[PDB]
Design a protein around this ligand. Structure first.
Ligand SMILES: Cc1cc2nc3c(=O)[nH]c(=O)nc-3n(C[C@H](O)[C@H](O)[C@H](O)COP(=O)(O)OP(=O)(O)OC[C@H]3O[C@@H](n4cnc5c(N)ncnc54)[C@H](O)[C@@H]3O)c2cc1C
Ligand SMILES: Nc1nc2c(c(=O)[nH]1)N[C@H]1C(S)=C(S)[C@@H](COP(=O)(O)O)O[C@H]1N2
Ligand SMILES: Nc1nc2c(c(=O)[nH]1)N[C@H]1C(S)=C(S)[C@@H](COP(=O)(O)O)O[C@H]1N2
Ligand code: MOS
Ligand code: MOS
Ligand code: FES
Ligand code: FES
Lengths: 523, 1249
């Protein structure tokens, strides 16, 4: 069979019934119906009795086209060259307008310069390809989705197929990497596999080929920056002017720009002297999506690149330009001196310059980067914990997704610690839409600690229940306590959650020093 | 190789399949469609029923048993299953929807089989059937849950003459008013040296057949493969020759002068029957209406559609002991057999000659019947069965008498079956009546006496008593003479006339009376079942509906057969020599304790050690010593029979029954109940005293889903898919026996196809065996116990014997009782019901230091007996109500008046009983039965009254998780209860919907598992449903409390908005709670039953007529669920008191009644003809849950009313027989055999005037 937009029972829309302003502000079709928005936009699916045959048969479906774009603009560079860097075009939005219209220096300067920073798309390269298996089941669907967000997978499938959410059960035991690429882009394959399973009443496996994934799905947003800096001889910043552009692909959804802004100052001091304007650019390319530290990468890159350019224009050592700009009484001021000393920075930086004077074709380099990364919390994450009366072993099923980050490792440590039993006695079961009902996407690096908080809280409920029994019977061991709890009909199942505001936000300071050797003749 | 299923073509690679693969195995495992079930594997139960369609050049559709039909005979046919008629997406079929919306599905395991039977029936009749035909057509579909009434209402509503009220949402059936069989050329060879041939001509057949004979291959001429159902097909069969495709072996020819009718050898019984309806208006063949009636007594619809005349006679040929009904009919008509031995070589011979001569290389080509004109010939025939349909005969008979012009016998053919293997004709009787008027003075008296002497029946268990079979054969001949006397206007005595009639059974009906309260809706609303539609469509999944797993094997027990002996040596080589048999596992393979139970044991369920595999003295015939694993269920079962055990020793006395142990009276007797009254003092005066007994046998649960566990090795642990009422005990047992952690043994139980107590604990021999195998072999293991394994190796309702004395005033008022009772435990004391026997021993009657009760637990050489619906409660009520009835008998006081004389004061039964006797017209109807009994010798009426006060109590803890989805506000529940057909999920959905304030349709219940169901107590005690309802309502009240502040602040316009606003605020929409003993107060359920019977004294057969039930259900949570629980419970009890019978071999201890052939619960026509159920109004429960009372168990205790009704009928026969007025021990069951044995009938009583 071949299925397309004509076979969709409900809205031709990848996303939830109720949309927000971050994830789902713009319409996205499961299968394109009017103007093709990018090369590789799916218009339907082929179903066949092997993965090989399905992929081969997809290439044999013969499309007839009418019309076609004047000019195809598939990259950030293409849209800025053709449209200009000035927003007065449908492809350029300005979500970030500096309150400073034009930069006025309140400090004098000895060196000024202009520069650019260009960072391209990055493909996630999760080693498990985009994958969903859908089974027809008692008039509903069982959905085996490689997703960071079961709730969105359920919501989307239920919306597109006009089903009750409770009849679309998603199970995700683990995924082979996600890095953000399985937060939302999993639901094109999942919605399509479900449509086929529901219409044909058979099991459908959708394992997306690497080519399909890299042709039709988005990537880390590309970044372009144009900046002016104004500095003293010391590298002390008097002012910055920075314009940046982020490549959305064809839809404005899932913008990282807010995070680019949050880390734009990194750990340096400013006084109404940093003009920052940020643009969202729509390109004729797949919709770009979160990739590990989205916006945070570009925000740090932008500020640290300006430091390195300052270093080069003033001839001051890059560490010394950082010293001249550090916020006062900051953790970085305590860390950086200890780091430069222990790494023998000064010596190794001089060794590299000496080596470079002696050799034309084999050059050495030393690169320093510092950061203050912002960690914040969002959404709600459930956990269910049960103790078995038979032997005191423990199971957990929760709304977190294990993608390799060691979330289940940490949960087991915390559940074991909270209950006072060995780690070996704790099992984590698959995440599903029952014990993980409504759970937010696993992302923002806080997934692991948020679920640890949900599990600890469930385990504290179990201890409160065990307390009266422990004081009454004074048990010799945990197994005897649990069996005595079971004898008194104490409930050894607890369900709880962690939500935004349960823990306080914080920053993570880090430093990196990198030594390279460059063959100048080969690169 | 080609078959069509549900409109889709499947290419069949035959070389790769077993030669003998069933259509069932192909449907389930190759097409992957799990709607079509199995249980008996022998044609008796109907859960596997599907339809075939094939090419007069017209399309015929007929039902078959998929378990019996061989795949290789279906090539080119179109197969239809329930999934083929409809599903959620495309819309449910009229039949699926009618069965769900009219409350005709509980556990649901029979529902697809029922739907496809109806589809078969409607299609075969061009969509035009009568209510009578519909009611006649479900003899092959056993339902253990519904009591059939709602199934019959639903299917009858499709009839042209329907008088059934159909709900307005039910859709209309399509127009049913009226693919080609594939027959490859030459053979098809099989790796194992097997051959199939599909001959199109008789030339082709004789080629194939001569072929098989010359190469010394055992052969079979395959039509329906139904004979396997009676005698298992030999494994030595190599040449399969399909004869279902030869025109020359079908059809019929009326001779030119209408003097003879030739029938195709391989006409189906159903085709023979249709042929009878066509020719029964042809002069000389009016007698074919009697042939039609006798064929309608054979087997059931699908076996008669598939099974053939020649197939049946081939059974009689191979097995002379087989009392073929086709044989006895054809022998009485002097049918000739056309034996054909080549295309141009054939002989027409007598039936007797066919049977006495070799058939090697020969076929039955046809059968020749001659014309027998109406007045010159009297032809009649009988098949006396232990239930209405689908049971083999105690005795069958066929009588052909030719009359001369002066009303004398020219000739007689008087034939019986079920006497002894070489008995056919009553020759001395044919010669006696020859040239006489049968009605002349003294002839019939002489004829019986002579007949009674010449009948010397054999006595091969489990056949009935020789004495019953002789009295039955006599009564049948008498019945014939009475019938033809009436037809020929021979004068009969007024009191003898009805002796010549068969009992009137009108089209059955029911009435239900109940209240609903809109102010509590959705609670107290009458609804379809939560899973009703998926049950009827075959969407619903059970444990063994898990898809095929790669490298899966099937398990079956290897059993010990020598009680008291030890197994010293096991030879597995004969099993392992079969290709596809993988391994044998025994106790030596068990890592952990060889123990079936939890790590921490109690004194009720688990006081005595029980081995998974016997290592010492064998405790009962059927005790497993190990398991075989093989690549098919068929091969596992066959290989397990081939493992040779060498025994050392053996008990010189085997005592496998309660009677065997008690007759020998000791270590086997314990006395848990010891009266504080050592000797009854009876200082009160008394006018009447007597002694009596009550004897009640075992009962097999007969859940339609067999004992089943599937275990998958998974990520270093196990996933267990077990048909269990207690997941936690399954988990505990598996982890203990394998030395694993419980958190690594995950059990999932979405639903079970009945339990009734039998899946509380006995699920775990198979579950633990399967898990052992999965662990050791590191592969998926499927253990679907055969019916023979279940009935041979697992226990049953405990048998009960009571000896009592009573002392009463002439009013029936009790002055004293002494009672001793014994309950049959089997070989272990575990799971005693004796507590509940004691609890209900006084019922609703007033005692005062005058009731001495002593109770013993008795260990027998038999499987460990287990809970079965209302354990102990049934015997407690039976014991007390029996003594009430015995009192009435001795005092001459009406049974209602003895009950009034003895009622507790200020008691609910004191308001309920008078209103019940008023509305049921008890007094006039009792006087009516007595007046009728006075006018008739051989047809007797009885009325039986039973009252009860059933105690309801709580135990254990039951968890429940509720989650609301923010996406659309729909709700899911996963809880620690098990849905087994009792409507737990239906009631849960109403409570969750009522509490949250949303529609029922928005609530879904998910599978029970060992996460959200961790530690949960066994679902039983009838309180399961209300207990999980308490847990779910508590969790939902928590959700309501979290939602309240969001309601007050955003004041939402609907539920969807409230829930998204709560999601935006990060309100936790998941709540987990529980219900535990003490959350609710215990209470009692009062019930009354009045049952009416008509007894045929001469055969023992009866028809249960009007039954009235009044039960306090409080304010019912769901009257539909509660009516269905009352009908089901009553009907399982009606089985216990009528046709269900367990026989243990008194020398070996083997359970001989171990399949559908030999164990007979109620069928569709075994139910009351007029079933009226009232839920008492204006009667809210002060205790329990939401003013409601449990219904799952109590009504089974009222079923003894049936036995009380037969007892009045039997006493009237005894009176007419001149027996001095004396009590007959009441017995579970009251079989036809029991009633004729105690009726005082003697063939000297057989008079015309
Ligand atoms: C649940 C159940 C209940 C039953 N109840 C009864 C009952 O109450 N009374 C009763 O009498 N029977 C009863 N039967 C038996 C039933 O009538 C027979 O099984 C059926 O008639 C066999 O026909 P078949 O086409 O299924 O034979 P198959 O099983 O296909 O073949 C049976 C045998 O007949 C041979 N055969 C087939 N055709 C010919 C031919 N033309 N010439 C020679 N040999 C041939 C085959 O070689 C084979 O050995 C019951 C069966 C079942 C399963
Ligand atoms: N092995 C592994 N580590 C990973 C990822 C992943 O997919 N695999 N994703 C990264 C991203 S983008 C995030 S936001 C988090 C997700 O888990 P956490 O939020 O619980 O740390 O882990 C990070 N580390
Ligand atoms: N359909 C169906 N009804 C049934 C049973 C069953 O297996 N199937 N079991 C009976 C028994 S023995 C009991 S204890 C209860 C179990 O469910 P409950 O406790 O929720 O009533 O249902 C009764 N009704
Ligand atoms: O938030 Mo990580 O999934 S881009
Ligand atoms: O308690 Mo019911 O399962 S005998
Ligand atoms: S499994 Fe086929 S009739 Fe029972
Ligand atoms: S519903 Fe018929 S067997 Fe359970």
């Amino acid at each position: 069979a071949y299925l397309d937009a004509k076979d969709i029972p409900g809205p031709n829309y990848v996303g939830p019934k109720i949309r927000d302003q971050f994830f789902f502000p713009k319409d996205e079709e499961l299968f394109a119906t009017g103007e093709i928005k990018f090369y590789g936009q799916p218009v339907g699916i082929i179903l066949a009795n092997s993965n090989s045959l399905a992929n081969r048969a997809a290439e044999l479906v013969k499309l007839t086209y009418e019309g076609g774009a004047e000019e195809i603009l598939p990259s950030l560079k293409a849209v800025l060259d053709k449209v200009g860097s000035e927003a007065g075009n449908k492809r350029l939005e300005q979500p970030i307008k500096s309150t400073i219209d034009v930069l006025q220096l309140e400090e004098p300067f000895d060196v000024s310069s202009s520069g650019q920073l260009d960072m391209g798309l990055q493909y996630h390269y999760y080693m498990e390809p985009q994958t969903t298996v859908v089974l027809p089941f008692e008039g509903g669907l069982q959905v085996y989705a490689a997703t960071q967000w079961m709730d969105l997978t359920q919501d989307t499938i239920a919306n597109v197929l006009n089903l009750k959410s409770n009849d679309v059960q998603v199970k995700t035991r683990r995924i082979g990497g996600g890095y953000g690429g399985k937060a939302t882009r999993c639901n094109l394959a999942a919605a399509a596999a479900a449509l086929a399973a529901h219409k044909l009443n058979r099991p459908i496996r959708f394992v997306q080929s690497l080519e399909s994934i890299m042709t039709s799905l988005g990537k880390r947003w590309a970044f372009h920056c144009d900046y002016d800096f104004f500095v003293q001889k010391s590298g002390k910043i008097s002012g910055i002017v920075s314009r940046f552009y982020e490549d959305a692909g064809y839809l404005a959804n899932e913008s990282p720009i807010g995070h680019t802004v949050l880390l734009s100052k990194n750990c340096y001091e400013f006084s109404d002297n940093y003009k920052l304007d940020g643009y969202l650019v729509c390109t004729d390319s797949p919709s770009n999506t979160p990739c590990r530290a989205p916006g945070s990468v570009e925000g740090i890159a932008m500020m640290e690149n300006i430091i390195e350019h300052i270093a080069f224009e003033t001839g001051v050592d890059p560490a010394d330009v950082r010293f001249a700009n550090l916020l006062p009484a900051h953790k970085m001021g305590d860390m950086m001196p200890r780091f430069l000393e222990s790494t023998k920075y000064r010596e190794r930086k001089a060794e590299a310059i000496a080596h470079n004077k002696e050799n034309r074709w084999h050059k050495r380099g030393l690169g320093l980067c510092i950061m203050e990364y912002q960690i914040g919390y969002f959404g709600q994450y459930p956990a269910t914990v049960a103790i078995y009366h038979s032997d005191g072993t423990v199971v957990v099923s929760h709304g977190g997704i294990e993608m390799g980050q060691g979330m289940n490792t940490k949960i087991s440590q915390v559940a074991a610690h909270t209950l006072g039993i060995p780690m070996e006695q704790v099992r984590i079961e698959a995440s599903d839409t029952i014990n993980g009902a409504n759970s937010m996407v696993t992302g923002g690096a806080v997934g692991s600690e948020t679920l640890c908080f949900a599990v600890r809280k469930a385990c504290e409920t179990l201890n409160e229940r065990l307390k009266p029994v422990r004081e009454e019977v004074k048990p010799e061991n945990w197994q005897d306590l649990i069996q005595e709890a079971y004898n008194r009909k104490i409930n050894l199942i607890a369900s709880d959650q962690c939500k935004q505001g349960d823990m306080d936000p914080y920053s993570v300071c880090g430093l990196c020093l990198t030594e390279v050797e460059l063959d100048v003749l080969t690169g | 190789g080609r078959i069509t299923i549900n409109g889709t073509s499947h290419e069949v690679n035959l070389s790769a399949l077993p030669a003998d693969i069933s259509l069932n195995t192909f449907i389930r495992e190759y097409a992957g469609l799990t709607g079509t079930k199995f249980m008996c594997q022998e044609g008796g139960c109907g859960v596997c029923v599907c339809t075939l369609t094939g090419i007069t050049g017209e399309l015929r559709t007929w039902a078959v048993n998929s378990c019996l039909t061989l795949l290789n005979t279906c090539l080119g046919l179109e197969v239809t299953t329930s999934e083929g008629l409809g599903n959620k997406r495309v819309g449910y079929h009229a039949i699926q929807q009618r069965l769900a919306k009219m409350n005709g599905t509980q556990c649901g395991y029979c529902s697809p089989g029922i739907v496809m039977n109806m589809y078969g029936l409607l299609k075969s009749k061009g969509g035009k059937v009568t209510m009578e035909e519909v009611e006649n057509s479900f003899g092959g579909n056993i339902c253990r849950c519904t009591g059939y009434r709602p199934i019959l209402d639903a299917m009858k509503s499709f009839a042209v003459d329907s008088n059934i009220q159909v709900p307005a949402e039910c859709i209309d059936i399509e127009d049913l008013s009226t693919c080609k069989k594939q027959q490859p050329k030459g053979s098809q060879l099989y790796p194992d040296g097997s051959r199939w041939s599909w001959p199109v001509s008789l030339g082709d057949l004789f080629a194939a057949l001569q072929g098989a004979v010359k190469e010394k291959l055992p052969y079979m001429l395959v039509a329906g493969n139904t004979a396997h159902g009676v005698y298992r097909r030999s494994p030595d069969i190599k040449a399969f020759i399909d004869v279902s495709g030869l025109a020359e072996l079908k059809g019929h020819k009326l001779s030119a002068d209408n003097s003879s009718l030739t029938l195709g050898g391989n006409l189906s019984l159903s085709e023979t029957m249709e042929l009878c309806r066509q020719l029964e208006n042809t002069k000389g063949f009016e007698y074919l209406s009697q042939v039609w009636q006798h064929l309608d007594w054979i087997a059931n619809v699908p076996v008669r559609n598939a099974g053939t005349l020649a197939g049946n006679l081939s059974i009689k040929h191979a097995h002379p002991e087989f009392p073929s009904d086709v044989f006895i009919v054809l022998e009485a008509l002097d049918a000739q057999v056309i034996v054909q031995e080549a295309v141009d070589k054939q002989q027409t011979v007598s039936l007797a000659s066919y049977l006495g001569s070799s058939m090697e290389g020969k076929i039955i080509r046809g059968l020749v019947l001659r014309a027998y004109p109406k007045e010159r010939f009297a032809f009649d025939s009988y098949k006396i069965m232990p239930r209405a349909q689908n049971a083999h005969a105690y005795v069958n008979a066929a009588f052909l008498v030719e009359f001369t012009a002066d009303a004398k016998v020219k000739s007689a053919r008087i034939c019986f079956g079920g006497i002894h293997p070489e008995f056919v004709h009553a020759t001395a009787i044919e010669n006696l009546i020859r040239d006489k008027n049968p009605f002349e003075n003294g002839l019939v008296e002489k004829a019986f006496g002579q007949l009674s002497t010449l009948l010397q029946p054999d006595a091969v268990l489990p056949d009935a008593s020789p004495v019953y079979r002789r009295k039955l054969a006599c009564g049948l001949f008498y019945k014939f003479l009475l019938k033809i006397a009436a037809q020929r206007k021979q004068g009969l005595g007024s009191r003898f006339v009805t002796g010549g009639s068969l009992l009137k059974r009108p089209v059955s009906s029911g009435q239900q009376s109940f209240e609903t309260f809109q102010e509590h809706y959705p609670v107290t609303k009458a609804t379809e079942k939560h899973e009703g539609l998926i049950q009827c469509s075959g969407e619903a999944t059970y444990s063994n509906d898990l898809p095929t797993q790669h490298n899966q094997l099937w398990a079956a027990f290897v059993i010990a057969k020598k009680v008291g002996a030890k197994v010293t040596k096991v030879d597995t080589q004969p099993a392992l020599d079969l290709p596809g048999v993988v391994a044998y596992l025994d106790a030596k393979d068990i890592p952990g304790p060889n123990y079936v139970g939890p790590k921490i044991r109690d004194q009720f369920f688990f006081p005595k050690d029980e081995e998974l595999f016997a290592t010492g003295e064998i405790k009962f015939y059927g005790q497993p010593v190990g398991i075989i694993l093989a690549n098919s269920n068929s091969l596992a079962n066959r290989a397990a029979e081939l493992v040779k055990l060498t025994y050392e020793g053996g008990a010189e006395e085997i005592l496998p029954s309660l009677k065997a142990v008690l007759d020998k009276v000791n270590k086997r007797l314990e006395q848990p109940i010891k009266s504080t009254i050592d000797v009854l003092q009876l200082e009160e005066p008394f006018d009447v005293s007597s002694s009596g007994q009550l004897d009640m046998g075992l009962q097999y649960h007969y859940y339609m889903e067999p004992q089943t566990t599937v275990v998958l090795p998974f990520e270093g642990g196990l996933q267990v898919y077990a048909a269990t009422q207690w997941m936690d005990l399954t988990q505990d047992t598996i982890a203990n026996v394998l030395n694993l952690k419980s958190n690594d043994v995950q059990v999932k139980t979405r639903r079970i196809g009945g339990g009734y107590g039998g899946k509380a604990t006995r699920c775990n021999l198979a579950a633990a065996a399967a898990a052992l195998a999965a662990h050791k072999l590191n592969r998926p293991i499927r253990f679907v116990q055969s019916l023979e394994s279940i009935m041979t190796s697992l226990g049953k309702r405990w048998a009960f014997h009571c000896d009592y004395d009573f002392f009463v005033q002439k009013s029936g008022k009790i002055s004293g009782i002494v009672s001793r009772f014994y309950e049959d435990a089997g070989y272990l004391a575990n799971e005693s019901p004796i507590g509940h026997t004691v609890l209900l021993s006084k019922n609703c009657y007033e005692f005062s230091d005058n009731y001495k009760l002593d109770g013993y637990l008795v260990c027998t050489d038999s499987p460990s007996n287990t809970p079965c619906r209302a354990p102990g409660s049934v015997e407690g009520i039976a014991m007390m109500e029996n003594i009430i009835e015995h009192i009435a008998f001795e005092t001459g006081v009406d049974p209602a008046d003895v009950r009034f004389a003895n009622l507790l004061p200020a008691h609910k039964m004191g308001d309920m009983m008078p209103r019940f006797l008023e509305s049921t017209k008890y007094r006039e109807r009792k006087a009516e039965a007595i007046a009728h009994n006075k006018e008739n010798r051989w047809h007797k009426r009885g009325l039986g009254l039973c009252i009860m006060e059933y105690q309801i109590g709580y135990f254990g803890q039951y968890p429940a998780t509720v989650a609301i989805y923010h996406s659309d506000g729909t709700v899911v529940v996963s809880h620690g209860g098990i849905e087994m057909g009792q409507g737990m999920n239906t009631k849960i959905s109403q409570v969750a919907a009522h509490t949250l304030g949303i529609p029922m349709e928005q609530v879904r219940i998910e599978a029970s598992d060992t996460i959200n169901g961790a530690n949960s107590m066994v679902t039983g005690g009838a309180v399961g449903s209300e207990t999980l309802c308490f847990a779910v309502r508590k969790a939902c009240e928590t959700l309501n409390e979290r939602l309240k502040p969001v309601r007050e602040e955003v004041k939402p316009e609907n539920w969807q908005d409230l829930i998204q606003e709560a999601y935006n605020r990060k309100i936790n929409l998941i709540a987990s709670d529980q219900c535990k003993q003490g959350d609710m107060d215990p209470y009692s359920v009062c019930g009354l039953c009045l049952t009416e019977v008509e007894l045929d004294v001469l055969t023992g057969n009866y028809i249960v007529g009007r039954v009235d039930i009044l039960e306090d259900t409080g304010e019912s949570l769901n009257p539909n669920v509660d009516i269905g629980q009352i009908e089901g419970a009553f009907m399982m009890g009606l089985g216990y008191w009528t046709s269900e019978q367990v026989i243990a071999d008194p020398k070996t201890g083997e359970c001989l009644t171990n399949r559908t052939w030999t164990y007979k619960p109620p069928g569709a026509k075994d139910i009351p003809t007029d079933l009226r159920i009232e839920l008492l109004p204006k009667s809210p429960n002060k205790a329990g849950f939401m003013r409601s009372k449990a219904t799952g168990e109590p009504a089974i205790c009222l079923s003894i009313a049936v036995a009380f009704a037969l007892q009045q009928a039997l006493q009237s026969a005894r009176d007419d027989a001149g027996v001095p007025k004396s009590w007959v021990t009441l017995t579970a069951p009251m079989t036809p055999e029991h009633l004729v044995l105690h009726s005082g009938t003697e063939p000297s009583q057989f008079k015309l005037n």
